[PDB]
DNA sequence: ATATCGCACGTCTATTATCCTCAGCGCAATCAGCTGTGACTACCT
């Protein structure tokens, strides 16, 4: 299902607020569904940072 | 004839509300990967 969000003005200045906020539980559930497991997500972020280091070098 | 009031001529000081440089989120610059065209260079059995 689509994930809803709340457009809440930032507690800081009125410079550019109106930030979107999502429920943490829904985001975690969606991430687990997409990636299968938390270990897969950890491996994905590790290989992403490794690729970032490879690209910068 | 000499001090004295009206008028003027300025000048010092102020009972009082302005212009600079740090913040998420979405559209655009960037990049790795892959492939296509052409000739080249070479290497094994």
């Amino acid at each position: 299902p689509p994930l809803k969000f709340i457009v809440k003005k930032n507690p800081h200045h009125s410079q550019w607020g109106d930030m979107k906020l999502y429920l943490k539980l829904q985001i975690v559930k969606r991430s687990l569904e997409v990636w299968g497991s938390q270990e897969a997500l950890e491996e994905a972020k590790e290989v992403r940072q490794e690729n970032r280091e490879k690209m910068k070098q």
Side-chain angles (χ1 to χ4, degrees), chain A residues 8-50:
Chain A
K8 179 181 180 180
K9 190 174 184 179
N10 198 273
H12 295 354
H13 305 344
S14 305
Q15 35 203 1
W16 40 62
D18 330 322
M19 59 181 181
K20 301 178 179 179
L21 302 181
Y22 295 80
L23 181 57
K24 181 180 180 180
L25 187 143
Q26 295 181 353
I27 296 301
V28 170
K29 179 181 180 180
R30 183 58 54 88
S31 180
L32 291 180
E33 291 178 354
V34 170
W35 297 96
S37 61
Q38 183 67 21
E39 303 178 0
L41 183 59
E42 297 176 359
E43 180 181 359
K45 68 174 58 61
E46 288 178 357
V47 302
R48 281 299 179 89
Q49 58 86 14
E50 180 68 23

mmCIF file of all heavy atoms in Angstrom, chain A residues 8-50:
data_model
loop_
_atom_site.group_PDB
_atom_site.id
_atom_site.type_symbol
_atom_site.label_atom_id
_atom_site.label_comp_id
_atom_site.label_asym_id
_atom_site.label_seq_id
_atom_site.Cartn_x
_atom_site.Cartn_y
_atom_site.Cartn_z
ATOM 1 N N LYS A 8 4.954 18.882 7.631
ATOM 2 C CA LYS A 8 5.081 19.683 8.839
ATOM 3 C C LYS A 8 6.196 20.699 8.653
ATOM 4 O O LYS A 8 7.281 20.353 8.174
ATOM 5 C CB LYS A 8 5.364 18.801 10.059
ATOM 6 C CG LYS A 8 5.540 19.574 11.355
ATOM 7 C CD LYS A 8 5.836 18.642 12.518
ATOM 8 C CE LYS A 8 6.015 19.417 13.813
ATOM 9 N NZ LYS A 8 6.303 18.517 14.964
ATOM 10 N N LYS A 9 5.926 21.948 9.025
ATOM 11 C CA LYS A 9 6.937 22.989 8.921
ATOM 12 C C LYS A 9 8.111 22.677 9.840
ATOM 13 O O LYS A 9 7.934 22.185 10.958
ATOM 14 C CB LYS A 9 6.335 24.350 9.270
ATOM 15 C CG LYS A 9 7.245 25.527 8.966
ATOM 16 C CD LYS A 9 6.534 26.849 9.201
ATOM 17 C CE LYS A 9 7.411 28.023 8.800
ATOM 18 N NZ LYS A 9 6.719 29.327 8.994
ATOM 19 N N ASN A 10 9.316 22.960 9.356
ATOM 20 C CA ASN A 10 10.516 22.644 10.114
ATOM 21 C C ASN A 10 10.569 23.479 11.392
ATOM 22 O O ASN A 10 10.190 24.656 11.382
ATOM 23 C CB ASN A 10 11.762 22.903 9.265
ATOM 24 C CG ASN A 10 12.994 22.204 9.806
ATOM 25 O OD1 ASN A 10 13.696 22.736 10.666
ATOM 26 N ND2 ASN A 10 13.261 21.005 9.305
ATOM 27 N N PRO A 11 11.025 22.902 12.507
ATOM 28 C CA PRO A 11 11.151 23.693 13.744
ATOM 29 C C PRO A 11 12.144 24.835 13.632
ATOM 30 O O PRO A 11 12.099 25.758 14.455
ATOM 31 C CB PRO A 11 11.601 22.655 14.781
ATOM 32 C CG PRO A 11 12.208 21.549 13.978
ATOM 33 C CD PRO A 11 11.411 21.497 12.710
ATOM 34 N N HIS A 12 13.036 24.802 12.647
ATOM 35 C CA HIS A 12 13.988 25.882 12.423
ATOM 36 C C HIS A 12 13.283 27.034 11.710
ATOM 37 O O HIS A 12 12.053 27.111 11.662
ATOM 38 C CB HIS A 12 15.196 25.372 11.642
ATOM 39 C CG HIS A 12 16.011 24.359 12.384
ATOM 40 N ND1 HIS A 12 15.764 24.022 13.697
ATOM 41 C CD2 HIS A 12 17.071 23.611 11.997
ATOM 42 C CE1 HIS A 12 16.635 23.109 14.087
ATOM 43 N NE2 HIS A 12 17.439 22.841 13.073
ATOM 44 N N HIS A 13 14.069 27.959 11.161
ATOM 45 C CA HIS A 13 13.532 29.149 10.519
ATOM 46 C C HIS A 13 12.596 28.778 9.367
ATOM 47 O O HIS A 13 12.530 27.632 8.916
ATOM 48 C CB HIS A 13 14.666 30.030 9.999
ATOM 49 C CG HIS A 13 15.675 30.401 11.041
ATOM 50 N ND1 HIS A 13 15.435 30.271 12.392
ATOM 51 C CD2 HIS A 13 16.931 30.896 10.928
ATOM 52 C CE1 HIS A 13 16.498 30.671 13.066
ATOM 53 N NE2 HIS A 13 17.419 31.056 12.202
ATOM 54 N N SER A 14 11.874 29.787 8.878
ATOM 55 C CA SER A 14 10.953 29.632 7.761
ATOM 56 C C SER A 14 11.661 29.660 6.414
ATOM 57 O O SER A 14 11.019 29.918 5.388
ATOM 58 C CB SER A 14 9.878 30.721 7.810
ATOM 59 O OG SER A 14 9.207 30.720 9.057
ATOM 60 N N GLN A 15 12.968 29.408 6.413
ATOM 61 C CA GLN A 15 13.798 29.442 5.218
ATOM 62 C C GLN A 15 13.279 28.497 4.138
ATOM 63 O O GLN A 15 12.861 28.947 3.067
ATOM 64 C CB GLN A 15 15.234 29.098 5.607
ATOM 65 C CG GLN A 15 15.329 28.064 6.725
ATOM 66 C CD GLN A 15 16.645 28.117 7.474
ATOM 67 O OE1 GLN A 15 17.509 28.942 7.181
ATOM 68 N NE2 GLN A 15 16.803 27.235 8.454
ATOM 69 N N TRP A 16 13.300 27.190 4.406
ATOM 70 C CA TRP A 16 12.548 26.231 3.597
ATOM 71 C C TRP A 16 12.216 25.037 4.489
ATOM 72 O O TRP A 16 13.024 24.117 4.633
ATOM 73 C CB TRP A 16 13.298 25.810 2.336
ATOM 74 C CG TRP A 16 14.787 25.579 2.452
ATOM 75 C CD1 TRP A 16 15.425 24.652 3.227
ATOM 76 C CD2 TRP A 16 15.814 26.253 1.713
ATOM 77 N NE1 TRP A 16 16.784 24.729 3.038
ATOM 78 C CE2 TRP A 16 17.048 25.702 2.111
ATOM 79 C CE3 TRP A 16 15.810 27.277 0.762
ATOM 80 C CZ2 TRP A 16 18.264 26.139 1.590
ATOM 81 C CZ3 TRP A 16 17.017 27.714 0.251
ATOM 82 C CH2 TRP A 16 18.228 27.148 0.668
ATOM 83 N N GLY A 17 11.026 25.063 5.081
ATOM 84 C CA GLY A 17 10.578 23.963 5.910
ATOM 85 C C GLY A 17 9.641 23.043 5.160
ATOM 86 O O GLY A 17 9.993 22.526 4.095
ATOM 87 N N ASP A 18 8.443 22.840 5.708
ATOM 88 C CA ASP A 18 7.401 22.033 5.073
ATOM 89 C C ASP A 18 7.914 20.631 4.750
ATOM 90 O O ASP A 18 7.611 20.052 3.704
ATOM 91 C CB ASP A 18 6.871 22.723 3.815
ATOM 92 C CG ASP A 18 6.950 24.233 3.901
ATOM 93 O OD1 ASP A 18 6.706 24.784 4.995
ATOM 94 O OD2 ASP A 18 7.270 24.871 2.875
ATOM 95 N N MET A 19 8.705 20.084 5.667
ATOM 96 C CA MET A 19 9.319 18.781 5.472
ATOM 97 C C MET A 19 8.280 17.672 5.580
ATOM 98 O O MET A 19 7.322 17.758 6.354
ATOM 99 C CB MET A 19 10.438 18.551 6.490
ATOM 100 C CG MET A 19 9.992 18.626 7.939
ATOM 101 S SD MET A 19 11.354 18.388 9.096
ATOM 102 C CE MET A 19 10.494 18.517 10.661
ATOM 103 N N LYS A 20 8.476 16.628 4.780
ATOM 104 C CA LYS A 20 7.608 15.463 4.826
ATOM 105 C C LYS A 20 8.107 14.480 5.876
ATOM 106 O O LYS A 20 9.303 14.184 5.953
ATOM 107 C CB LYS A 20 7.549 14.784 3.458
ATOM 108 C CG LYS A 20 7.045 15.679 2.339
ATOM 109 C CD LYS A 20 7.051 14.946 1.009
ATOM 110 C CE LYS A 20 6.525 15.828 -0.112
ATOM 111 N NZ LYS A 20 6.539 15.124 -1.424
ATOM 112 N N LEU A 21 7.182 13.975 6.688
ATOM 113 C CA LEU A 21 7.505 13.032 7.747
ATOM 114 C C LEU A 21 6.708 11.753 7.537
ATOM 115 O O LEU A 21 5.499 11.804 7.284
ATOM 116 C CB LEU A 21 7.209 13.624 9.128
ATOM 117 C CG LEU A 21 7.945 14.921 9.471
ATOM 118 C CD1 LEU A 21 7.583 15.390 10.871
ATOM 119 C CD2 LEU A 21 9.448 14.737 9.333
ATOM 120 N N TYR A 22 7.391 10.617 7.639
ATOM 121 C CA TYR A 22 6.788 9.303 7.493
ATOM 122 C C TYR A 22 6.913 8.538 8.803
ATOM 123 O O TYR A 22 7.828 8.779 9.596
ATOM 124 C CB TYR A 22 7.453 8.500 6.367
ATOM 125 C CG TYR A 22 7.265 9.078 4.982
ATOM 126 C CD1 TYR A 22 8.045 10.137 4.537
ATOM 127 C CD2 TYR A 22 6.319 8.551 4.113
ATOM 128 C CE1 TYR A 22 7.879 10.664 3.271
ATOM 129 C CE2 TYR A 22 6.147 9.070 2.844
ATOM 130 C CZ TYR A 22 6.929 10.126 2.428
ATOM 131 O OH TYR A 22 6.761 10.647 1.166
ATOM 132 N N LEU A 23 5.981 7.614 9.026
ATOM 133 C CA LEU A 23 6.037 6.774 10.213
ATOM 134 C C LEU A 23 7.229 5.828 10.126
ATOM 135 O O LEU A 23 7.453 5.192 9.091
ATOM 136 C CB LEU A 23 4.739 5.984 10.368
ATOM 137 C CG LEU A 23 4.647 5.082 11.599
ATOM 138 C CD1 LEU A 23 4.844 5.893 12.869
ATOM 139 C CD2 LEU A 23 3.315 4.351 11.628
ATOM 140 N N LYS A 24 7.996 5.740 11.215
ATOM 141 C CA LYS A 24 9.197 4.911 11.211
ATOM 142 C C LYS A 24 8.857 3.440 11.013
ATOM 143 O O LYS A 24 9.555 2.727 10.282
ATOM 144 C CB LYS A 24 9.978 5.109 12.510
ATOM 145 C CG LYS A 24 11.265 4.307 12.588
ATOM 146 C CD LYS A 24 11.985 4.547 13.905
ATOM 147 C CE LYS A 24 13.267 3.735 13.989
ATOM 148 N NZ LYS A 24 13.983 3.958 15.275
ATOM 149 N N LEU A 25 7.790 2.965 11.660
ATOM 150 C CA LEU A 25 7.421 1.558 11.546
ATOM 151 C C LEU A 25 7.061 1.196 10.110
ATOM 152 O O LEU A 25 7.469 0.141 9.607
ATOM 153 C CB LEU A 25 6.261 1.244 12.493
ATOM 154 C CG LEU A 25 5.836 -0.218 12.652
ATOM 155 C CD1 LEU A 25 5.429 -0.491 14.091
ATOM 156 C CD2 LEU A 25 4.693 -0.567 11.708
ATOM 157 N N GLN A 26 6.298 2.056 9.433
ATOM 158 C CA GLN A 26 5.927 1.784 8.048
ATOM 159 C C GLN A 26 7.148 1.771 7.140
ATOM 160 O O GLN A 26 7.258 0.923 6.248
ATOM 161 C CB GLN A 26 4.907 2.815 7.566
ATOM 162 C CG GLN A 26 3.575 2.754 8.290
ATOM 163 C CD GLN A 26 2.578 3.767 7.765
ATOM 164 O OE1 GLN A 26 2.914 4.611 6.934
ATOM 165 N NE2 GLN A 26 1.344 3.688 8.248
ATOM 166 N N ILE A 27 8.077 2.708 7.350
ATOM 167 C CA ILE A 27 9.291 2.749 6.537
ATOM 168 C C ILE A 27 10.121 1.491 6.754
ATOM 169 O O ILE A 27 10.641 0.900 5.800
ATOM 170 C CB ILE A 27 10.097 4.023 6.845
ATOM 171 C CG1 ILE A 27 9.301 5.267 6.447
ATOM 172 C CG2 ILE A 27 11.436 3.997 6.124
ATOM 173 C CD1 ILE A 27 8.935 5.313 4.980
ATOM 174 N N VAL A 28 10.259 1.061 8.012
ATOM 175 C CA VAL A 28 11.023 -0.149 8.305
ATOM 176 C C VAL A 28 10.365 -1.365 7.666
ATOM 177 O O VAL A 28 11.043 -2.221 7.084
ATOM 178 C CB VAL A 28 11.184 -0.324 9.827
ATOM 179 C CG1 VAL A 28 11.756 -1.696 10.149
ATOM 180 C CG2 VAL A 28 12.078 0.767 10.393
ATOM 181 N N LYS A 29 9.036 -1.461 7.763
ATOM 182 C CA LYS A 29 8.331 -2.588 7.162
ATOM 183 C C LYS A 29 8.500 -2.603 5.648
ATOM 184 O O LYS A 29 8.733 -3.662 5.052
ATOM 185 C CB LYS A 29 6.850 -2.535 7.537
ATOM 186 C CG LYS A 29 6.015 -3.658 6.947
ATOM 187 C CD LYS A 29 4.556 -3.522 7.350
ATOM 188 C CE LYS A 29 3.713 -4.642 6.763
ATOM 189 N NZ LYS A 29 2.279 -4.513 7.143
ATOM 190 N N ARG A 30 8.392 -1.436 5.008
ATOM 191 C CA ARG A 30 8.564 -1.365 3.561
ATOM 192 C C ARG A 30 9.984 -1.739 3.154
ATOM 193 O O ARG A 30 10.187 -2.445 2.160
ATOM 194 C CB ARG A 30 8.211 0.034 3.060
ATOM 195 C CG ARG A 30 8.279 0.190 1.550
ATOM 196 C CD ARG A 30 7.362 -0.802 0.855
ATOM 197 N NE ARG A 30 5.990 -0.711 1.343
ATOM 198 C CZ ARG A 30 5.071 0.107 0.840
ATOM 199 N NH1 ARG A 30 5.375 0.910 -0.169
ATOM 200 N NH2 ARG A 30 3.846 0.121 1.349
ATOM 201 N N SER A 31 10.981 -1.271 3.910
ATOM 202 C CA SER A 31 12.364 -1.621 3.608
ATOM 203 C C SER A 31 12.600 -3.117 3.759
ATOM 204 O O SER A 31 13.291 -3.730 2.937
ATOM 205 C CB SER A 31 13.314 -0.833 4.511
ATOM 206 O OG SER A 31 14.665 -1.150 4.229
ATOM 207 N N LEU A 32 12.035 -3.723 4.806
ATOM 208 C CA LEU A 32 12.177 -5.163 4.991
ATOM 209 C C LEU A 32 11.499 -5.933 3.864
ATOM 210 O O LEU A 32 12.022 -6.951 3.397
ATOM 211 C CB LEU A 32 11.607 -5.582 6.346
ATOM 212 C CG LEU A 32 12.387 -5.128 7.580
ATOM 213 C CD1 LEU A 32 11.713 -5.619 8.853
ATOM 214 C CD2 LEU A 32 13.829 -5.611 7.513
ATOM 215 N N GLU A 33 10.329 -5.469 3.422
ATOM 216 C CA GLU A 33 9.647 -6.129 2.314
ATOM 217 C C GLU A 33 10.451 -6.023 1.023
ATOM 218 O O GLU A 33 10.566 -7.000 0.273
ATOM 219 C CB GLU A 33 8.251 -5.535 2.125
ATOM 220 C CG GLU A 33 7.277 -5.863 3.243
ATOM 221 C CD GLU A 33 5.922 -5.215 3.040
ATOM 222 O OE1 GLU A 33 5.777 -4.424 2.084
ATOM 223 O OE2 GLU A 33 5.001 -5.496 3.836
ATOM 224 N N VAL A 34 11.010 -4.844 0.745
ATOM 225 C CA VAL A 34 11.741 -4.644 -0.503
ATOM 226 C C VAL A 34 13.044 -5.437 -0.500
ATOM 227 O O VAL A 34 13.368 -6.132 -1.469
ATOM 228 C CB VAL A 34 11.994 -3.145 -0.742
ATOM 229 C CG1 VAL A 34 12.964 -2.947 -1.895
ATOM 230 C CG2 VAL A 34 10.683 -2.429 -1.024
ATOM 231 N N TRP A 35 13.806 -5.352 0.587
ATOM 232 C CA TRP A 35 15.123 -5.973 0.656
ATOM 233 C C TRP A 35 15.099 -7.379 1.243
ATOM 234 O O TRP A 35 16.151 -8.024 1.301
ATOM 235 C CB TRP A 35 16.076 -5.094 1.471
ATOM 236 C CG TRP A 35 16.319 -3.751 0.858
ATOM 237 C CD1 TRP A 35 15.677 -2.585 1.156
ATOM 238 C CD2 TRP A 35 17.271 -3.434 -0.164
ATOM 239 N NE1 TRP A 35 16.171 -1.560 0.385
ATOM 240 C CE2 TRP A 35 17.151 -2.056 -0.434
ATOM 241 C CE3 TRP A 35 18.215 -4.181 -0.876
ATOM 242 C CZ2 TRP A 35 17.938 -1.411 -1.386
ATOM 243 C CZ3 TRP A 35 18.994 -3.538 -1.821
ATOM 244 C CH2 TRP A 35 18.851 -2.167 -2.066
ATOM 245 N N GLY A 36 13.945 -7.866 1.672
ATOM 246 C CA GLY A 36 13.873 -9.213 2.240
ATOM 247 C C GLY A 36 14.243 -9.338 3.701
ATOM 248 O O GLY A 36 13.470 -9.889 4.490
ATOM 249 N N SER A 37 15.416 -8.838 4.086
ATOM 250 C CA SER A 37 15.873 -8.940 5.463
ATOM 251 C C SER A 37 16.787 -7.767 5.779
ATOM 252 O O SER A 37 17.297 -7.090 4.883
ATOM 253 C CB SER A 37 16.598 -10.267 5.718
ATOM 254 O OG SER A 37 17.741 -10.390 4.889
ATOM 255 N N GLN A 38 16.985 -7.533 7.080
ATOM 256 C CA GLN A 38 17.859 -6.448 7.515
ATOM 257 C C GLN A 38 19.313 -6.709 7.137
ATOM 258 O O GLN A 38 20.052 -5.764 6.836
ATOM 259 C CB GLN A 38 17.730 -6.247 9.026
ATOM 260 C CG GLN A 38 18.543 -5.087 9.579
ATOM 261 C CD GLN A 38 18.045 -3.737 9.095
ATOM 262 O OE1 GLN A 38 16.894 -3.599 8.678
ATOM 263 N NE2 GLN A 38 18.912 -2.733 9.148
ATOM 264 N N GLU A 39 19.737 -7.975 7.148
ATOM 265 C CA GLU A 39 21.100 -8.303 6.742
ATOM 266 C C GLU A 39 21.340 -7.934 5.284
ATOM 267 O O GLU A 39 22.421 -7.453 4.926
ATOM 268 C CB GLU A 39 21.372 -9.789 6.970
ATOM 269 C CG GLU A 39 21.164 -10.247 8.404
ATOM 270 C CD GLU A 39 21.406 -11.734 8.581
ATOM 271 O OE1 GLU A 39 21.735 -12.407 7.581
ATOM 272 O OE2 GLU A 39 21.266 -12.230 9.719
ATOM 273 N N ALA A 40 20.340 -8.156 4.428
ATOM 274 C CA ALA A 40 20.463 -7.759 3.030
ATOM 275 C C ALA A 40 20.616 -6.249 2.900
ATOM 276 O O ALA A 40 21.413 -5.768 2.088
ATOM 277 C CB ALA A 40 19.254 -8.249 2.236
ATOM 278 N N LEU A 41 19.861 -5.484 3.692
ATOM 279 C CA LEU A 41 19.987 -4.030 3.657
ATOM 280 C C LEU A 41 21.362 -3.578 4.138
ATOM 281 O O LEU A 41 21.949 -2.645 3.575
ATOM 282 C CB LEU A 41 18.885 -3.389 4.501
ATOM 283 C CG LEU A 41 18.845 -1.861 4.510
ATOM 284 C CD1 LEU A 41 18.656 -1.325 3.100
ATOM 285 C CD2 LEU A 41 17.747 -1.357 5.433
ATOM 286 N N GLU A 42 21.883 -4.217 5.189
ATOM 287 C CA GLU A 42 23.221 -3.879 5.667
ATOM 288 C C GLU A 42 24.276 -4.184 4.611
ATOM 289 O O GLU A 42 25.190 -3.382 4.383
ATOM 290 C CB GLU A 42 23.521 -4.634 6.962
ATOM 291 C CG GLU A 42 22.608 -4.264 8.120
ATOM 292 C CD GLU A 42 22.876 -5.092 9.361
ATOM 293 O OE1 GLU A 42 23.766 -5.967 9.312
ATOM 294 O OE2 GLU A 42 22.197 -4.867 10.385
ATOM 295 N N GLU A 43 24.162 -5.338 3.950
ATOM 296 C CA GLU A 43 25.090 -5.663 2.873
ATOM 297 C C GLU A 43 24.972 -4.661 1.731
ATOM 298 O O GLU A 43 25.980 -4.262 1.135
ATOM 299 C CB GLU A 43 24.837 -7.084 2.371
ATOM 300 C CG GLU A 43 25.757 -7.517 1.242
ATOM 301 C CD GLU A 43 25.464 -8.924 0.760
ATOM 302 O OE1 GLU A 43 24.552 -9.568 1.321
ATOM 303 O OE2 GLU A 43 26.145 -9.386 -0.179
ATOM 304 N N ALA A 44 23.744 -4.242 1.415
ATOM 305 C CA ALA A 44 23.539 -3.269 0.350
ATOM 306 C C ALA A 44 24.196 -1.936 0.683
ATOM 307 O O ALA A 44 24.858 -1.337 -0.168
ATOM 308 C CB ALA A 44 22.044 -3.081 0.092
ATOM 309 N N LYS A 45 24.034 -1.456 1.917
ATOM 310 C CA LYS A 45 24.650 -0.178 2.269
ATOM 311 C C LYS A 45 26.170 -0.295 2.326
ATOM 312 O O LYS A 45 26.885 0.645 1.951
ATOM 313 C CB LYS A 45 24.083 0.351 3.591
ATOM 314 C CG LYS A 45 24.455 -0.441 4.830
ATOM 315 C CD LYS A 45 23.964 0.249 6.092
ATOM 316 C CE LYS A 45 22.458 0.454 6.063
ATOM 317 N NZ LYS A 45 21.725 -0.838 5.965
ATOM 318 N N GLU A 46 26.685 -1.447 2.767
ATOM 319 C CA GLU A 46 28.132 -1.647 2.782
ATOM 320 C C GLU A 46 28.704 -1.640 1.368
ATOM 321 O O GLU A 46 29.727 -0.997 1.102
ATOM 322 C CB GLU A 46 28.475 -2.952 3.499
ATOM 323 C CG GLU A 46 28.275 -2.903 5.004
ATOM 324 C CD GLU A 46 28.580 -4.227 5.677
ATOM 325 O OE1 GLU A 46 28.902 -5.198 4.962
ATOM 326 O OE2 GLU A 46 28.498 -4.296 6.921
ATOM 327 N N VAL A 47 28.053 -2.345 0.440
ATOM 328 C CA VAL A 47 28.558 -2.344 -0.928
ATOM 329 C C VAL A 47 28.357 -0.978 -1.574
ATOM 330 O O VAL A 47 29.154 -0.569 -2.422
ATOM 331 C CB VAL A 47 27.926 -3.475 -1.764
ATOM 332 C CG1 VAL A 47 28.199 -4.829 -1.120
ATOM 333 C CG2 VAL A 47 26.438 -3.258 -1.962
ATOM 334 N N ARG A 48 27.318 -0.237 -1.175
ATOM 335 C CA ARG A 48 27.126 1.110 -1.704
ATOM 336 C C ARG A 48 28.255 2.039 -1.271
ATOM 337 O O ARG A 48 28.792 2.797 -2.087
ATOM 338 C CB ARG A 48 25.772 1.664 -1.262
ATOM 339 C CG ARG A 48 24.592 1.145 -2.068
ATOM 340 C CD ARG A 48 24.721 1.515 -3.537
ATOM 341 N NE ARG A 48 23.609 0.998 -4.328
ATOM 342 C CZ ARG A 48 22.471 1.653 -4.537
ATOM 343 N NH1 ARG A 48 22.290 2.856 -4.011
ATOM 344 N NH2 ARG A 48 21.512 1.103 -5.270
ATOM 345 N N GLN A 49 28.632 1.997 0.009
ATOM 346 C CA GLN A 49 29.735 2.847 0.450
ATOM 347 C C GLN A 49 31.065 2.383 -0.137
ATOM 348 O O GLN A 49 31.928 3.216 -0.449
ATOM 349 C CB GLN A 49 29.794 2.912 1.981
ATOM 350 C CG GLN A 49 29.951 1.583 2.698
ATOM 351 C CD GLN A 49 31.399 1.152 2.833
ATOM 352 O OE1 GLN A 49 32.318 1.947 2.628
ATOM 353 N NE2 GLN A 49 31.610 -0.112 3.179
ATOM 354 N N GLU A 50 31.245 1.071 -0.317
ATOM 355 C CA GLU A 50 32.444 0.582 -0.989
ATOM 356 C C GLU A 50 32.513 1.089 -2.426
ATOM 357 O O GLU A 50 33.579 1.503 -2.897
ATOM 358 C CB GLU A 50 32.479 -0.947 -0.955
ATOM 359 C CG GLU A 50 33.700 -1.558 -1.627
ATOM 360 C CD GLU A 50 34.988 -1.266 -0.882
ATOM 361 O OE1 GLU A 50 34.928 -0.990 0.335
ATOM 362 O OE2 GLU A 50 36.065 -1.311 -1.515
#
